[PDB]
Motif scaffolding. Structure first.
Motif, short mmCIF file in Angstrom:
data_model
loop_
_atom_site.label_atom_id
_atom_site.label_comp_id
_atom_site.label_asym_id
_atom_site.label_seq_id
_atom_site.Cartn_x
_atom_site.Cartn_y
_atom_site.Cartn_z
N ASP A 92 0.73 -1.32 -0.03
CA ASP A 92 -0.04 -0.07 0.09
C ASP A 92 0.91 1.30 -0.01
O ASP A 92 1.66 1.47 0.74
CB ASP A 92 -0.90 -0.22 1.24
CG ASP A 92 -2.06 1.18 1.29
OD1 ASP A 92 -2.10 1.95 0.60
OD2 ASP A 92 -2.96 0.65 2.11
N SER A 97 0.03 -2.08 4.37
CA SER A 97 -1.47 -2.64 4.54
C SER A 97 -1.33 -3.61 3.65
O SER A 97 -0.50 -3.62 2.60
CB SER A 97 -2.54 -1.76 4.50
OG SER A 97 -3.13 -1.93 2.93
N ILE A 129 -3.64 -4.34 1.49
CA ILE A 129 -4.86 -4.17 0.37
C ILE A 129 -4.55 -4.85 -0.95
O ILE A 129 -5.40 -5.54 -1.54
CB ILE A 129 -4.89 -2.59 0.23
CG1 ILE A 129 -6.08 -2.29 -0.94
CG2 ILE A 129 -3.59 -2.06 -0.10
CD1 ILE A 129 -7.39 -3.13 -0.60
N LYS A 160 -5.20 -8.65 -0.26
CA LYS A 160 -6.47 -8.75 -0.30
C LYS A 160 -7.05 -9.06 -1.67
O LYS A 160 -7.91 -10.02 -2.03
CB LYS A 160 -7.33 -7.84 0.58
CG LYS A 160 -6.80 -7.83 1.89
CD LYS A 160 -7.76 -7.16 3.16
CE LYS A 160 -8.45 -5.79 2.40
NZ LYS A 160 -9.31 -4.86 2.93
N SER A 194 -4.00 -8.61 10.48
CA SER A 194 -2.78 -8.15 9.80
C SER A 194 -2.01 -7.16 10.42
O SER A 194 -2.70 -5.78 10.53
CB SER A 194 -3.32 -7.63 8.13
OG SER A 194 -2.21 -6.99 7.69
N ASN A 217 0.30 -3.97 10.46
CA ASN A 217 0.56 -2.98 9.67
C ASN A 217 1.54 -2.20 10.24
O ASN A 217 1.63 -1.83 11.53
CB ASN A 217 -0.62 -1.91 9.31
CG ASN A 217 -1.65 -2.63 8.56
OD1 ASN A 217 -1.56 -3.65 8.10
ND2 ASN A 217 -2.64 -1.62 8.11
N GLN A 241 -4.61 -4.62 12.16
CA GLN A 241 -6.02 -4.24 11.37
C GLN A 241 -6.67 -5.74 11.28
O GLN A 241 -6.04 -6.77 10.85
CB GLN A 241 -5.80 -3.75 10.07
CG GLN A 241 -5.22 -2.43 10.13
CD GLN A 241 -6.34 -1.30 10.76
OE1 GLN A 241 -6.66 -1.25 11.93
NE2 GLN A 241 -6.97 -1.02 9.75
N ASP A 248 -8.50 -6.87 8.90
CA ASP A 248 -8.52 -6.49 7.36
C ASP A 248 -9.58 -7.49 6.58
O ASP A 248 -9.02 -8.82 6.49
CB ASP A 248 -7.17 -6.33 6.87
CG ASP A 248 -7.14 -5.26 5.80
OD1 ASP A 248 -8.22 -4.59 5.72
OD2 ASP A 248 -5.85 -4.96 5.28
N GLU A 255 -12.19 -8.47 2.80
CA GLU A 255 -12.47 -8.37 1.65
C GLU A 255 -13.65 -8.99 1.04
O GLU A 255 -13.38 -10.18 1.34
CB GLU A 255 -11.18 -8.06 0.85
CG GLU A 255 -11.59 -7.46 -0.52
CD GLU A 255 -11.40 -6.02 -0.49
OE1 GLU A 255 -10.84 -5.47 0.55
OE2 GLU A 255 -11.75 -5.41 -1.39
N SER A 310 -12.15 2.39 11.39
CA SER A 310 -12.24 1.62 10.11
C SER A 310 -12.25 2.41 8.92
O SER A 310 -12.52 3.54 8.90
CB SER A 310 -13.37 0.91 10.23
OG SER A 310 -13.48 -0.14 8.95
N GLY A 323 -12.16 1.68 4.30
CA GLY A 323 -12.37 0.71 3.29
C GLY A 323 -12.68 1.32 2.08
O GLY A 323 -13.04 2.53 2.03
N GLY A 372 -10.30 -2.32 6.59
CA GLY A 372 -9.55 -2.76 7.76
C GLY A 372 -10.31 -1.93 9.10
O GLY A 372 -10.69 -1.19 8.97
#
Lengths: 294, 294
Positions: free
Chosen positions: A47, A75, A77, A80, A95, A97, A116, A118, A120, A217, A219, A262
């Motif tokens: 990220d 992260s 991301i 995911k 996760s 970070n 986090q 995290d 998806e 949070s 997202g 997250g």
């Protein structure tokens, strides 16, 4: 604090609460068919955390692995999205970070290491994810009342504000947080390439806690189209080279629409305990800008 | 494998099983009153992983954090002792470990990143910890029979081998693993300073899987006395400086007797799935000696 000072704190109650939160949150997701993944900490890509009005443009910690530059996870991301490409459908991970942010971000909710939860979901829209988070938080807050004997905001759903309108009415997210007495959503925030943008509207969402506790949070729905992703990366002055294997996957047409978020576990512990600073609930504080002694 | 190849693998069943394993293991510990801690990835101190028959004497990877050299987590052993020092009694954490070992360690069960379910118990003895792990494994194996429709080791009697007897009878723990049909223990292994040694006897234990799958858990009772700890560090040739704040805490007499172990989650996923190589059950392989592409 120094080492002995750190270990001399009594944070037993905070850790008991954290244990209950982790039990609750993990079960929330496995009960709903989510797959539980393990985190990655080192990868050629991570990220960028930029553009992002919440950040100052930090670069990730880097370490060589067999001669090759790896980045410590800002992260997961991108990973995911890759898990969704692997057909796992609904995923979550606890996760860690690593975000080496400055002293200027030591506002009581930031930590330079933090975990986090995290998650998806393939094909999900922002409304779906926001609703899932409300369900989780409402339920958590009812449980928290039992655990603490104190009262928590009772809202089952939270009001929604565009980022632009937050700036206008309150000046900042932080000021809005200070004024609110229940959690609330800030949506449509122009930021990183992976958040879905459609004709000037960002399909993203941050959950902000009341009483000044701030964002808990963050997202969004995602971009999945190669050309769109590359254009956004270039427009921000970032480098395709920094995302090579991910862009190879995108070019091959293998990213799929998805949405996720997250959730800051330690930020929730802080909120439920009512701690002034997140460090007060952490066995090993990681205060932005202050290298930890342990 | 390039990135597209990595994400084109099928891992759905393995991840389904992993989800069930994580659900089962985390509940096993919270049911028993363990506190659930979050991991740390960067610290001035980490597990030396040496001396240790199973290791290569690698030096931990390091990164600068606000001008201070930090070590990536080899293992959280020292931090577990610190959590016991903080009066947390019984703790566990899903802790990512980063161990950059050579291609020589790519034997099908090693991964240069991996998550240990790592736990520690104030005042516990090796027999307490071994019995607990036996209960966990027995229960897990009975569940796995339900999940998979296949037969797993009876897991009621676990033979205990002294380390020297393993060497004499089989040559290596690897060769032992290949000849067994039930999990078994290897105890009394001379290694790191934190494992308790009394009168030439080391109070530690590795759980070895049958059918060649190798070690799945490793732990011991701990040294807690400053003079005892310092002697073993100096005798091994390690530098006291490398463990400064930990030694400060030990000097302050704040360490307490404890015992614990780490359990390889991905190694268990591999065993239950029956995968020949651990990478086959991982979304993002981290093969020893091979820098990952994603």
């Amino acid at each position: 604090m120094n080492a002995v000072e750190i270990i001399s704190r009594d944070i037993y109650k905070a850790i008991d609460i954290q244990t209950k939160i982790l039990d609750y949150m993990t079960k929330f997701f496995t009960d709903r068919g989510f797959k539980w993944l393990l985190p990655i900490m080192l990868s050629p890509i991570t990220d960028p955390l930029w553009p992002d009005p919440a950040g100052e443009g930090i670069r990730p910690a880097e370490v060589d692995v067999y001669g090759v530059r790896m980045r410590l996870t800002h992260s997961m991301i991108l990973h995911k999205q890759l898990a969704i490409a692997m057909g796992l459908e609904k995923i979550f991970v606890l996760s860690p970070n690593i975000r080496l942010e400055s002293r200027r971000k030591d506002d009581g909710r930031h930590s330079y290491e933090f975990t986090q939860l995290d998650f998806e979901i393939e094909g999900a829209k922002m409304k779906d994810v926001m609703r899932l988070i409300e369900e989780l938080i409402y339920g958590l807050f009812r449980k928290a009342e039992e655990w603490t004997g104190r009262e928590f905001p009772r809202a089952r759903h939270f009001k929604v504000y565009d980022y632009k309108d937050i700036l206008e009415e309150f000046g900042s997210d932080e000021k809005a947080s200070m004024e609110m007495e229940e959690p609330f959503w800030i949506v449509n925030i122009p930021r990183e390439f992976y958040d879905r943008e459609e004709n000037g509207v960002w399909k993203n969402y941050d959950l902000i806690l009341p009483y000044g506790y701030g964002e808990v949070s963050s997202g969004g729905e995602r971009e999945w189209e190669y050309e769109k992703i590359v254009a956004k990366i270039r427009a921000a002055g970032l480098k395709e080279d920094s995302f090579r294997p991910y862009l190879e996957i995108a070019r091959a047409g293998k990213l799929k629409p998805s949405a996720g978020a997250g959730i800051g576990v330690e930020r929730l512990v802080r909120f439920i305990v009512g701690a002034k600073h997140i460090a007060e609930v952490q066995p090993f504080p990681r205060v932005p800008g202050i290298p930890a002694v342990i």
